[PDB]
Each structure stands twice: as C-alpha cells, then as structure tokens.
Subunit: 498 residues, 4 copies
Amino acid sequence: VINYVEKAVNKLTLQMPYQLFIGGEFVDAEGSKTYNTINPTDGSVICQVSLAQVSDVDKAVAAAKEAFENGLWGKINARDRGRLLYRLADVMEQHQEELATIEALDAGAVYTLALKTHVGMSIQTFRYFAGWCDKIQGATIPINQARPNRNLTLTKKEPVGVCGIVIPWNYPLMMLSWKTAACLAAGNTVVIKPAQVTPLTALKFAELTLKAGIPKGVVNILPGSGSLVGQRLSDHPDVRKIGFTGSTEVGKHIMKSCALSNVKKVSLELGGKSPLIIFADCDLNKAVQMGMSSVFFNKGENAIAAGRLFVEESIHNQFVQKVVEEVEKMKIGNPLERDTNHGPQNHEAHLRKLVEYCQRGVKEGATLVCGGNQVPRPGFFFQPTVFTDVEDHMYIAKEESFGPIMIISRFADGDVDAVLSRANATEFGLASGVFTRDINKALYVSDKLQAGTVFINTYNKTDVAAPFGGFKQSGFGKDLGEAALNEYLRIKTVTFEY
Amino acid sequence: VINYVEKAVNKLTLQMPYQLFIGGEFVDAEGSKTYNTINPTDGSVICQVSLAQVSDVDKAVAAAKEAFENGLWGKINARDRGRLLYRLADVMEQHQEELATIEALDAGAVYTLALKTHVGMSIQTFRYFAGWCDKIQGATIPINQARPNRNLTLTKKEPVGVCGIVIPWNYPLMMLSWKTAACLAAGNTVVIKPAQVTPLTALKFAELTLKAGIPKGVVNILPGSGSLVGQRLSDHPDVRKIGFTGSTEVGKHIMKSCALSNVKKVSLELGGKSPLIIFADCDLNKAVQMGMSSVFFNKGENAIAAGRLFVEESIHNQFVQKVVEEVEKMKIGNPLERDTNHGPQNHEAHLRKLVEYCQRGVKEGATLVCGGNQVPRPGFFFQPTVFTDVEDHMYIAKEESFGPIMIISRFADGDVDAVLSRANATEFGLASGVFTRDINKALYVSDKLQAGTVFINTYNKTDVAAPFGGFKQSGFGKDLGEAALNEYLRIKTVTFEY
Amino acid sequence: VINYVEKAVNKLTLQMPYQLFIGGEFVDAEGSKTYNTINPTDGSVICQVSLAQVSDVDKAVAAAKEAFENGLWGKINARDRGRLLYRLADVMEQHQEELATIEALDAGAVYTLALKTHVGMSIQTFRYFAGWCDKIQGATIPINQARPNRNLTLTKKEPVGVCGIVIPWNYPLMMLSWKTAACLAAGNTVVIKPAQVTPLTALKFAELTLKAGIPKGVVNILPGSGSLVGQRLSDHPDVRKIGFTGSTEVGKHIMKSCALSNVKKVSLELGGKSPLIIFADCDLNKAVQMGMSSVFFNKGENAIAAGRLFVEESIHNQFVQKVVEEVEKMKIGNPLERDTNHGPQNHEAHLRKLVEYCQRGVKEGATLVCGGNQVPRPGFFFQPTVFTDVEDHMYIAKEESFGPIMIISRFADGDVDAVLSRANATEFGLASGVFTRDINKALYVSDKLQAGTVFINTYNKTDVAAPFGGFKQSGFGKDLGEAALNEYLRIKTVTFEY
Amino acid sequence: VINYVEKAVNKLTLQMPYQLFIGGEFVDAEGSKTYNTINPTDGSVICQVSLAQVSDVDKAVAAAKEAFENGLWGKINARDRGRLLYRLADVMEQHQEELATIEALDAGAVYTLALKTHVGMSIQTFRYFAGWCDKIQGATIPINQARPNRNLTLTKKEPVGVCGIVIPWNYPLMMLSWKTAACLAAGNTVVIKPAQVTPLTALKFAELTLKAGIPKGVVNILPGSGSLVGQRLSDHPDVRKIGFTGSTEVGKHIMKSCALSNVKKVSLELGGKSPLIIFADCDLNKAVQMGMSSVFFNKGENAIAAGRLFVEESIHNQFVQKVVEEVEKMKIGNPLERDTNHGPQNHEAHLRKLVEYCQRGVKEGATLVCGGNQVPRPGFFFQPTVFTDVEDHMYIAKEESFGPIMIISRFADGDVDAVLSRANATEFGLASGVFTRDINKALYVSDKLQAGTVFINTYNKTDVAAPFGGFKQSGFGKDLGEAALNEYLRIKTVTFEY
Ligand SMILES: NC(=O)C1=CN([C@@H]2O[C@H](COP(=O)(O)OP(=O)(O)OC[C@H]3O[C@@H](n4cnc5c(N)ncnc54)[C@H](OP(=O)(O)O)[C@@H]3O)[C@@H](O)[C@H]2O)C=CC1
C-alpha cells in the first residue's frame, strides 16, 4: 500500500503520492526531509513532498543500473517492451481526468487544456514511441572485401543504459513524457528529476508505471533541486546519458558536468526567442487568432512561444487593434473553472520575473498597450500583455519572457530579407513562424529562418511524430519523432571476415 | 606563387607548403612565429612551420563564416558540391605518392602502408562522402490534422555552419580526411587544427583544395597548439560544431569548452583499451597473424589497437611461441625502405612514454617476453613488445599504450562470460575483437562486448562506409558511414496548415 | 443481429458467422447459394457457407471503393487508423481461444499450436502494423536548383486504394492477417477471398472488425472459388492492387489477369522447394529437432517447409536413426486434444495428393524409411514420412509436397559448393536453411543460397518484423516487416519552384 | 577494331557503331540482317543497322548470365562497381558533343537541348547511381527471441540478376541511362532493346562501356523489333526482371509475358494524359512560358507533357492570346542549327499520327487556334498547335498525342474541386501540374491530383534524385531516385539462432 495525499476537488478524489519513487516503491528521502509544493491559484501549500538527497540519487541510479543489467527490462523482446509502454499509455488514459486535475493544482494548467495537451499529448507520446520498439533497426553495409576472403558488416542499435532526465515546470507531465517515452522505447532505464516546484504528476505517473507492470527500477523519480539532485545525476559515474530541457545557462552547466565526469551523452532543449513574421497578404483574422495563441498558449509558459511578432507596416495598426479586442475577451481565473482561459503563472519566483521583465520593457521605451502587471487577486496571476514600438536593441527584443507578453515590431512593406535578418539576429533558434498566403514567400522564409521548427500559417502545432529541438544556443538533439530515438541509442558496428 | 619547402626524396621533388592556410591563401602567422617539425626517422628538423596565434584563429573562422554565408559553397547544388569533393579525391590520387612520402617524413608512416592506408583510405573517404551530398534526405511525416484544416509536416536537412576540427598525429592526413570529408559533404565550412607535431600533409592537402577548385575559405588549416589554437576554436562564438579526435582528458576539456561558450555541438573520438578475445577453436596461425596486426599496425599508433589479448589457456603458450617467432621476423627501419615492417614512433615524447610504460609493466609483475625498449639507432624507434602473465589489476591492463605493445592474459578453458566480464571491465569502449570458428560464441560475444566496433575473425578492418566511434569514455558520435553525416547536419521541421 | 452457427466444443460455445461480409454487414450470396465446409478430423460437414458470385464481388468492391473515397477510413489521422488496428488486435486477443478452436475445426490446426501461431502471430501482425501507420514517411530531396529560382522536392506516401487479397488454406487466419494488416495500415480498403475450403476464421475475423469499430466497407470478405471470385477481383477495373499467396501456376494467371485488365499492382508469394543443408559439424540432436520441425510443423502445410534435406555423409545414418526414434514419439490425433502433436491434413483432395506423391517416390526408387500412408482412422490424417536415398532427378526431389514428408539426400564430406549447386537447382527460392557450428560455412552458405529467407541453426523462425518473400518462381514482394508496406503504398513526387 | 559509320557533321566527326553489341563485341545479327535508320530532318537514310534475331537475344542473355555468375562484375566490391560507373559517366561527358549530335540525327533532338538534357541528364544519372553502389544497405531487425536462445535477423540487398530493358524513342539515350544506371548500380547485368527507330546513341553508349572498362557481357544491346527481340526478352527463362517504358497496351503485353514465362519482376512506365491547372492568381507571363514548355518541350515527345491545360475563366482568353504570340516566335528547323528551338518529330509514322490526331480534334468540334499541319519543308516537322473549346468527352481530351499540341479547357472562377475531378477523370496518372501563388490552393491541389508527379509553379522539372513513375494505367515502379534501386534489388532475410 502507498501513502497518498487525498483531495476532493473537481468532482474527483485525487490520490497523490508524495514520496521518492525508487526501485519500484515510494520511500521517504534521507532523514525524512520534505518541502512544500505551492498551488499557484491561491498561494497555498498543496502538500509536503519528499526532498531527495545525494544518497537518494545514488540509490535511484543503483536501482536503474540493476534493472537494466539484470532485471526483466533488459531481457524482454523489443516487441514486449512496446506492449508495456502501450499499456502504460492506456493506464494514463484511464487516469486522464485525475492527472489533468493534479496538473491544474500543481502548475496552474487550465483543466480543459491540461486534459487535451499536458495529459492528452503525454498519452499520444507513449503510444507513439511504443510503436517504435520493434521497428528500431540497424544496417548491413557493403564494405570492401579482404580478398580472397569475404566480409560482412552490420550495425546493431543498442540502448545507452542508465539515463538521467532533468525537466522544467511548464508542462510537468508532458515534458516528462516526451523524454521518458523515447528513453524507455529505446530499452533504457531512467532516473527522472522533475522541476522542484512541480513534482505531483511525475509522482502520480510513477504510480501508474506500477499499474502498467513496468519492472521495478526501470523508472525512478526524484523530487528535489537541480543544484543537488540534478547535479549528482550529471556527475554520476553510472549514468551514461543526460536528457535536459530548461534554461540555456543551466544547459551549459549540465553539459560541462557531463564532460567533467565520464563524457556521458547529453541532449539540450534550451531557451527560445522565436520570431513570428506576419505579412500583409495573410488572412488577418486568422493571424490574430494564431498570433494570440502563439504568445498566450499555456499562459505563455511555452519554450516555442513567439517571442517577437514582426508585422508588416500596412496591417500593423489594424493587427494591434484586433489583438487588443481579443485580449479583452480573455477570462482570467481558477484553472478548474470551465470558462477560464488564462490561468495563473506557474510559481511566484516566475511571476516576479515577469513583473521585472515588463518594468524593463517600459523603462527602455517600448509602448505598453495593455497588461504588464500581476492581476490583483490571490495566487500568481499575470495580466496578458502587449508591447508595441519594440526596437531590435531592446532587452525585451532579445530576452525570453516565458510569460504572456506579446512583443510587436514593424517591418516595411515589401521588405523580406530585412525582416529575416532581424528575426535571425538572436543566439536562440528553437522555433519561428510565418503567416502569408504567398507560396513563394512562405517557402523562401522557411528556408531562411534559423530555427529548429518553422510554422507556416499556424503556430504551436507540435506533434509526437514531428521532431522538436533547437539550433545555436537553443541546444541540440530532438524530442519527438524518430529522431528522438537517436539520443537514447548507440550504434555498434560488427565486422566479420569469413 | 605559394612558398614551398622543397626536398628531393623517394624519387620525387616534394613541394611542401609550411604556412597557415586562411581564406584560400598561404600566409605567415601573427608576428611571423614558427616552430620546427621533426623527422622521427633521424630526429632532424624537416622545416619551420607557421605557428598560429589567436588572431589567426579569428581570421580563419571569419573566412569560414563568410564562405558559408555569402560564398559559392553555400549556393551551389548538393550535386555540384559532390562533384567538387569527387574532384578533390582525384587530385589527392594524382598526388598520392607525394602525400605518402610527406606522411613517411612527418609521421614515420611506413611508405608502402601510407600509400594504401594513410593516403589511400583518405581518397576513398572523399569519394564516399562525395556520393552522399545529393542523397542526404529529410522526411515527410503523417502528423495529426487540425481538422477541418490540413497539415503538411516535412523536415529539411541543413548544414550546421562553421565547424572546427581538431585531430591527432597518428594518421595525420587520414584523421583529417575522415572528419573533413563528412563535414564538407554536409555543406559546412571548416577550420582544421592538425596535431602540432604533424602539420605537413594537412598543409599539402590545403593546396590540393585549391587545385580542386574548392572555394576560398571553405577549408582553413592552422598548425599550432591545442591549448592555444584548439582552445580558441572551442571557445569561438561563430563556431557551431567541434569534431574532435584525441585523448579522453582533452576530450573532456573540449566538451566543457563547447558548453561554456555557445553550446556548440561536439563529437568525441577518444581513447581505447580494446580487448581481443582468442578462443582455442580459432585458426591459430591466422590468429597469430591478425593478433600481431591488431597490436603492431602503424607502430601501435592506432586508437582501436587491441590493448589486451585474452588467450584461451590451452592455446596460450603455443600462441606466444608463434608470436615471438613472427616478431623476430619483423624488419625495423626507415619508412622509405620497401621491406620495412615497423617504422619509428611518431615523435620523441611518445617514445619516452613508451619506455616508461614498459618499465612500469615489468615493475608491477608482468613478464616481458620481448622488446620493451628504444631500438638503438638514430630517430625514435621502439621494439615490438610482448607482455605475458598480465593480470586485471595491473596498470598495463588498464592504460592505453598507443604503441607496439602486445599485452596478453590467459582465460580459462570453456569459460565465456568470465572473460567477457574482464574484457568489459574498462571505461573505454572503442573497439574489440573475437577469434573463434564457433558461430555461437562469435554471435554471443559480439552482443556482449561493450564497444563501438566488434571485429570477428579479423582486426583493424575499418571501412569508409562502416561507422566508427566509441561508447563510455571512448566518446560519442561516428566518423565514417552514413551515421557520420548526422554530426554535421541539423534538422529543421517545417509545418504548414492549409 | 448476426446469424451464427453455434457449436459447443472445447469448453466453449463458438459463434460462427457463415455469410458474405459486405459493407459492414453479413449477407447471403446472390440466389442464397451455399457450399459445405468440411472438418478434417472426421470428414463431417461443419456448416453451410455463402458462395459469393460475380455480382457479390462487384458489391464488395463498390463498398470498398466508397469506404476509401468517401468514408471515414480515408479521412482519419494515420495515428487514429493505427488506434483502430490496435483495437482490432485487442479484440482478436479477447477472442483468441474461440478463433483457435474455429481454426482447429476448419483447418485441422492443432489447438495449442493455433493459439501460439495461427492466432497468436495474427494478433502480433495487427499490433506490429498498427505501429507503422503514423511512422510511414516520405522524403525531401536535394534536387538541382533552377537558378536564379529555387526548388523544393518532397515525396508523399499515399494508399494505393482498393485492394484484393487472395489467400490459401494452410493458415487461414494468419495468411489473411499478414496481408490485411499491412494493407490496412497503409490506409487501403480491401476485398478478401479466403480459400474456399477454409472460410470460417476469416468470417469470424470480419465480425471482429465490427466489434473493433473498423468503418463499414473497409474490410469485405467473400468465401468462394478462385476461378469465379478471385478471377473477378483480378479483372475488376476499380481494384488497383492484388496481394496473392498460393501456387506458382495460379500466381502466373493472377499476374496475367492484372496485366490484361488495368495493370493493377501485384505481389506474389508462391510455392517452395526449400533446401536445408546439415553439416557434420552441427549439433546433431538439435539438428534432428529442428530438421523434424522444418518438415512436420503444421502437418507440413507450410510454404517454407524444408522440401529437401541434404545431410553430410558421415552423420547421415545417425541422423536418420535419430529422426526415426523421434517420429515414433509423435502423437497423432484430434487437434483439440492437448496431447496431440500432429493433426489431420487440411482437406481430402490434399490428402489424396500426398498418398500419390509417396506412391511415386517409392516407384521412382527412393527408400521409404517410414510413413507414406493415410493413417487408419476417420478424417484426413497422414503418417509423418521419411524418404532417404533421394537422387536429384527424382520427382520428389523437384516437386513440392506441402505435407509432412522429409526428403533426404546425402552429400560427400567436405563438399560445400557441390551441395549448394544441388540446393539451388530449382526454379523455387522461397526459403532455405543450414545447420553448422562453423561460422565461415554458415556465412558463406547463406550468401550462396538462392532463397528469400535463409535460416541458420534454426528453422521456421518467421517474425512479424522480418520480411518474407521469394525469389525466382516463388514470386516477388514481401509480407511482414517494413518492406511489406511498399506493396500497399504509392509514392507521389511533388516539385515546387519558388 | 570496331566498324563505324563515319560522318562529318556539326564540327566534329561522328564514329557510329551500327552492329549488335554482345559479350563486349560488335557483331552482325543472324544472317547479317539489317534495317535502315532514318534522319527525321530530311527523311534520308543515316545508315544500315544490324537487325537482332531470336538467336541473337539468346546469345546476349547468355553473355549477361555469364558476366553476372562468373565474370568480374559479380566479384568486385560495390565501391569498385561505383568507380566503373563514375568512369562511364566521365567517358560519356568526354563524348558529350558526339552523343548529342548522334541524338540530333537519329531522333531529331535539338542539339542545344540534347547536350543539356538527352546527354547531360544521362551523364548525371550515371554519376548519381554510381554514388549509390556502396550505400545500398540492408537491415538488422529486433525480432522476438526464441528463449532461452537468441536470434539475429538481418537482410541483405542482392542483385536480381540478368535484366532486360526495353525502351521507347523519345529520348533514346536518356531512357536507356535512367534504367541502365539503376540496373548496373544494383549489381545486375543487362540486355537492352532500344526502340527500333532510334538505335544509334545506344550503340555509341555500348562502345563507351568498353572505354570505361565495364566487363564483357555486363551490357548487351540489341537493335530490333519489340515483337521479336522485346518479346523474347520477356519470355526468356534466364531473364529475371524486365524494365519497361512505353505505351500502356505494350506494357500490358509485357506484364502478361513476364507472368506466363517465369514470373520475372516487371516495372512499367506507361502513357500519360497529364493535366496542368492554371489559376487566375498565378504569374500569367510565367504561366505562358511554363505552359508552353509543358506541351512543346522536345517537340511534345515527352511522356509527362501536359496533355490537357485547364485555365481559369477570367484569364483564359488573355492566356490564349499570349500563347499564340509566343508560338509565332518559335524557330522551326534543323536541330543542329543554334537558333532552332523546335525540331522535327521523331519519325514519319508519328508525324502522320499527329496529323490525324488534329483532324479528329477539328472534326469533333474543338477550336483549332493555330498549327495542326505538317510544316512544308523536308523531314517530319509538325506545327506547334493550340486547341481551345476542348470538352471533357472529346477524343483529344482523353487520348495522349505525344506531340506539340496544347489542349485547352476553361473552368469556372473559384471552382477547385470541379476542375480536380475533371483533371483526375482518366486512367492515366503519370504527371500533373498547378500554377497558383496561393499556398493553400497549391498544397490542396497537389494532395488531390492523382498522379505520380505533381509540379507546382513549374513543369518538366525532373531530377536524377527525384523518383519518377505513374499511378493507375500509367504503370508502377520508379525510375530515378533511391526508389529506382528497389526494382533492381532483392531482399534476402537471414535469421540465426544462437
Ligand atoms: N512513363 C514514361 O517514363 C514514358 C512513357 N512513354 C510512352 O511511350 C509511348 C510512345 O512510344 P511508343 O512507340 O508508342 O511505345 P511502344 O509501347 O509501342 O514501344 C516501346 C518499346 O516497346 C517495344 N515493344 C513493342 N512490342 C513489344 C513486345 N511485344 N514485347 C516487348 N517489347 C515490345 C517497342 O519496340 P519497337 O521499336 O519495335 O516499336 C519499343 O522498343 C507513349 O504512350 C508514351 O507516354 C515514353 C517515354 C517515357
């Protein structure tokens, strides 16, 4: 039997585990240390959660190692590994309302969105990658023959072994799922560190692995801080790969730590300052709707959020006019209320940063059209924000807000290369977008944009089959798609002479 | 006119450039600094070579960046890029005797071997990767449709941009060729740092890129030190990828340097301590020939050299007898003598390391069966060496010699898993081999060996089409094969709604 | 409400549809015509089954065409098509005992074997291909650019459209599943003709498509004759692809009919006379076990069954002795009885053919070591048979028995190429096998065998992920694996200029 | 020493072989039979050409078989096969002017076009496929393991063996090259039947295979009739694959002949009635240029020629006015003259057919806007022709002309689905095209068009890397791209247990 924090809310009875998940059981951290997880709708403590220590990390890694080297996960058929991951997805589907509610409490995710995206996409992720298990294939290669003898060369795709996954707080379950699904589908075992501020759906997910029959030690979950738990994972001599999603500066440190220990492999999904270029020949009403969504989706807590909108001179003023109209219709409120469409920010420290971000925007001369402030109510709500007259030298033109802040610049009618240059003048390169009805402009702009994803007449259209990752200082490696598997596999070349 | 060091040798008049190669021109380093490159056959100075400074690195990177962004290389068809790389191979083949002679002089490479391997495989590498240019393909992906609308998702494979390549001294031209061919085939431009002790074939190669019509600035070559030139490449804000081959310790530092600058991509080909397991049911005389080659090839200066031979008890002593008989037949001498089997070690400091390595093996209790010291003669020759009674705890059982030192341990008759455990008990993982006539042992042992390459009934059988790279602390990423391309390409996902 | 033939057998109540399945409903054939399906255990009539006429084929094709062009199947996401096929697999697994019992009745498949293979592999087939749906991907291709303009070239994989599947009687459900799973995963719709003598699992499968929610018209099943129903499918102007498994002579006629109508695509899985070469250095007892299995599995009604065994001279007599010892232990009986090893042949005409086959073998001078005759008991049982002293000119050396008849020839000790020549001297090339502990022989022999599958130290080891198809007159195209999809897809190239 | 027909023309000396090419030597046909090849510029006889008989086919097939089974071609490394084909491409380039001049003489190809396309693309084809040789790769597949044992499954890509290639006359050398390059790159040997009316570049190409060092027997060339030589290739028991390009009716017969002999593999590139849909939002001047090119390229003797132009109501008359203006500017004349941009039709029978075809268009009520007649000069020149008021039921709306005949229909403004239906109402499906600046219409139309190639804002843009083939009665299988290799390879599955 497992200890839960029980909570009657959203017409359900939530049963939330709150302990470390190690070697297939929920256990207290070393010394029974704990910390509070905060509900962002009202600032209250949801419950106490175990706080992993170094010795807990070592225990998690040991369990992962044993499960890989000697446990059932390392022995079963790829096909049957796949069956287990499908079953895991089914179990997650059976708990989708409960998971979405926990995500609503823990991260302020609007329930209807959490159900469709945070949770729904997590389910798709496990089903998608389950299908890959018995379709991961190596090669036979026609090398030169050592005459009078013959040669056969083949490759085998093998798991990398024990992995660490370190994720952020914006979509707690979904970021976990993206990376964990690829990791497990490739035959690895894993120690996962959720963002300290959002441990709850991870811990519930841990319980669901038990229900699905995932062998003990294959999935291990350690709520705790990056500087302690995350750091130890990156240092550990038995971890052979880190999968990381978070800020560029922590990414740099993680990669450094991978190097200095045992050259463990690393993938990095880092920040974004993603440009959206809106031409006069677009469908303007659709540009407003998709433009809205590109910034405000998931309260702007979205690595690929459009961080600059460049709007062609002749439609700029009309675009801003319509954006303001639509911004005014947004209902701000409790994520559990069905009419809510803008929930609170994830946690307090992030709310503070958003306040400062907008102060600086105003200080440096941008026009604040609306918002920019904490909403006066309990919790950590932030008013949807629109800036105009944003110039390329400005802080808010360079730096990622990760909040609901639309940052608008003009470009002259008929300029294409000039706006492209401005769009590309960033060390980020995670995503980008273009709205235009012109085929030639769409294709040309998408060649020239220096970003891992280019959206054309849409935005935020991610898919579990479509690889997702950055260029330049947005990192390297893919989540999602066939390409994701490559971060979690190694290639062995086997060459015979006969 | 290019300045040459001219040398009448080996029936040829070598014309050897000696300066930095930047933006299509041979130029002195800052302050006209130079250093000596040393002939390992007699310890004489071959000539002075420009010694790149930081400002020279910055110039080379600036030339590479301009060549990629605005030069011809970034505009031509993939197919036409292929034609240029094929033509480069042709030029290399037209100069193959000269390149092999230069390699004999600079690296102590035995001339017959240098023709066939150092130079011959370099030519194969360019031809092979030339064929890939117009066959690098992205995907179209059946994502979920945003009904009532439609979606098209495709991927585009793009170059990474400016690359730095840092290589070692054991096969100067060939290591350059492996990485550079893949790098250029993928459409990138490059700054190459050859090992300071072996700049000459790299500089001759630079001139050949001119004869081949490779556009100015696509290839830049900077002889100089790792800690100065190599460091600046890893730190440089406009370099987007480092391809590295060398020691594990420098590899760690390189990766750290990529992290701390701009999270540039990195691939690491690091040390080996590769195990060769020889069973009693093998063809013994063949095992002796291949066993010897697995150690002594290219005077042991070979990252995949078998660093331990595990020989089944019942054949051990006969195996050692035959090896000693064969070792006595090896002709040691000048790399230009056509009957030379064994040339000098690459440079003086390495010879001294090899003397110390062998003193240490004796001191810790291994049996010196033959060799173990510098051959008394001018230059830097080391005796082919055989150690027996080697035990798992010993320094020479753990550490990579990178010299012609056969390190033999028995294993028990009819044991398989126990020898595998010993073979795997290393943080290296670059290569390995197994000699056996038994199909079941061969397949099982190749599954279980923790190494990027497993040779079966052969050794050193690399091939331009067969991917080559390590596991664990031997690094990550592949040179050669289709797989090598992936270190030099990025994936852009382009998603339409219509 | 569906009409069933109800039968209480095997501790179950079977509910067997017996009508045509067209447009999602069970309906009588034109003029309510029927025929008898015969239980091979006792010769009794199981029930009457609808006998499809030309007008019924036309109705089924029309239903398939509507379902493809206007129905849901053609509109849903590839991912959701996948979900439906995974649901179909679950439904099949929920009914596995029932399906295996029906197959035991209809085909004489030993129940324990039918659970694991006839039905078990069918279930695996749908799960496997279900995973392919959203992972079938086109390409983006780096074509030459019409400078000063640009080009993008991509490929789209599209369904072929309406398909006909015509299958034999040896594994009724499994052969249907192999082809139908791939066909449907590629987004096609289908009309299936089971072998007239074995319609029952096909019809039950049809009902399971309803339970799984496969849209109406996607699957249509027509019990009936090849020369009427199969022929009309091949001739139909709206059918775009025929998938055929059966005899070489019918296969010729099918290909010819695809030609003369509308050059519909065709794939052909035809006969076999597969050689199994057993060397003296094999594991003898293992060779006996697998040798027997290679012939007797599924009462020899197995297209890849070893049709000749070549046994090295020095182990031949001992091999024959051991086979005879093991043959005597086989338990012949009712397929529903748990101790049964060897069930009845599929139908009477086939039994008659096997009797004649063995009469001819004795007549032409081969040594009948055992069997050769109908077992004295009700139904259509045939004694496991062993022939020795078979010479290459004999009829039984050339002709496919498709029954439990082991046909043994000797080869001289050491005579590798000579035995290969003998093994390849056939216009068939479906499968082949070699038993040897010698890696060099195994690799060499497998290069030289002219067959689509080579087994090494095993036999009948098929897998839903491993492609299966013949060379020469055994046909072309694959069932199973990624390769099977290509038969059911078309490639559209799309080339933009911008 | 080879016998040539020598001719001083176009500033060079042609040296044209005129005999059969068998087993690496030029030889007379049985009974020294010959026939005349006719120059379409003046109706004169170029020379006499050997006329292959049945026994010549058998000799060619036997040479091909021997070259495959025992000659060097079946023994050399894949890489070295690649070198030979790249050398063949070089030799072709060295003879580019001569080949293009022969093509002008024999087929009426305008010399400047022949140099760039007929010959230029042929050279690209061999270079492209040469690069594939050592990059053709099989798989290793994670099949279910027969516990407590292990399984390894790999696939080997092998040559099919002796192939027959039968080609049409519209681009003699280029059709030969497309198919032959893919065939040889895959390791096969081949017997080629050029169109009887166009043997000369094929025979010169045969001579170039000697200069390139292609082993004797690998390439064999048989000028002669389809009904005799082609038929025997389809029937031959030793031919294992036919590659065919030509009319639908002959394709049907070829496929039938493949079936009835030995189920040899077959690919079919058949007729087209390719629709080009021009929207009012296109760049009209560019649409006129590309539209004209879509019809008139290579005097309309082009399988992918737009056989039907649908032009949006509002631009229709202006489009027709502009086409007529541009047609008046075309220079009709000797293909060797540099100002010629419209050469003669390929042969006399085809000119007649075009004359009759246009009579029929006029008779059935289509408006003949210009052309329709033979040009009053020597040879077989036909006027660039434009029809308007073409109705869907008309013969000329349904039948492929294969000549320079633009066939125009209107469609209503804003119709999209209606025009698509009309464009898709054909049993052909080889190519298609759409001109529009609207991204949404372009993507949607290319989804809906039922053809193997869709051009968007261009036409005739084929590329050696882009697969080319038809849907429906336009056939199946690809020429060009990676996909083309699949017609010329077989997959062998090899499964070990250990
Ligand atoms: N899809 C594609 O890639 C292409 C298709 N084509 C198509 O070809 C047609 C125009 O050429 P056309 O001359 O009419 O084509 P045909 O089908 O009449 O001839 C093509 C080739 O087939 C040969 N042939 C004829 N009968 C037989 C037979 N019984 N067995 C074997 N071979 C035979 C011909 O020989 P012979 O010399 O005696 O006539 C010729 O070499 C058009 O429909 C066009 O669309 C053309 C080019 C490319």
